Design a protein around this ligand. Sequence first.
Ligand SMILES: O=C(Cn1ccc2c(O)nc(NCC3CC3)nc21)Nc1ccncc1Cl
Ligand SMILES: O=C(Cn1ccc2c(O)nc(NCC3CC3)nc21)Nc1ccncc1Cl
Lengths: 122, 122
Amino acid sequence: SQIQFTRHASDVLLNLNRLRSRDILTDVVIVVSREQFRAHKTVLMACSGLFYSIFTDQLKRNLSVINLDPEINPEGFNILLDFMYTSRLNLREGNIMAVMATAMYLQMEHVVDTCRKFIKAS
Amino acid sequence: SQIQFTRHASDVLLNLNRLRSRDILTDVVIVVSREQFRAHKTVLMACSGLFYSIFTDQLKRNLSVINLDPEINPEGFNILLDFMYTSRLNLREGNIMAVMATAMYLQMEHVVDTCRKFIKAS
Ligand SMILES: O=C(Cn1ccc2c(O)nc(NCC3CC3)nc21)Nc1ccncc1Cl
Ligand SMILES: O=C(Cn1ccc2c(O)nc(NCC3CC3)nc21)Nc1ccncc1Cl
């Protein structure tokens, strides 16, 4: 019965992305081959089954650097990181396969299913 | 021209609230009179001009405890903290004045304006 603020969640996410852009309170570096990306662990956990599984484990909770599998495409990862912080997914014919495979590795099932629909649409 | 995921931001916020409920990666305690509340600084900064101003300052960025003004009502604060993490604001005739005054202190202008509309509706 509470009052619903229909733009609040989008506003929060936008502000979290602004904090990331200024490196404010970021607490992890994700290394993907020759590239590095900083982020907030909480957002990663909220958006990815892989990062949720890593950081929920007290053994790994405090890691400040995560090295992803060497086969992961950094562009695919960057596209997905931007999606996590924006709700907008930059799928293109030239990147669909890299994005899909990266989303499978990151355990982002709804994104994977969207990639399958994109393939079906050709 | 990117694909928009219309529930993504709400899903992220829900998952951030789940992390708060499990005390995962919370990094501040807010003390309000005899009560304490743990939270993520990033969400606080995203939702409040007061917390944004505090934590953007490199002098205060790493504070782990914030003592709010002793006059702040803990119930009012709890209502607003829950709003930050849910997008739902529990306004009632019995709490409107405490919530409004607390939102003024927390520099949550859209909430303050909503409180004014609630008063206008009686
Ligand atoms: O749900 C998530 C992260 N997430 C986002 C998509 C996604 C996906 O497609 N698969 C998975 N598989 C892993 C697990 C356990 C559910 N996780 C995913 N995080 C979370 C869950 C509950 N409380 C707090 C948080 Cl942060
Ligand atoms: O905008 C915010 C937090 N917020 C939410 C409502 C609100 C409000 O009604 N007033 C204020 N006044 C303070 C300031 C400077 C704008 N802040 C507010 N945070 C933010 C801004 C830009 N980049 C990252 C983040 Cl996290």
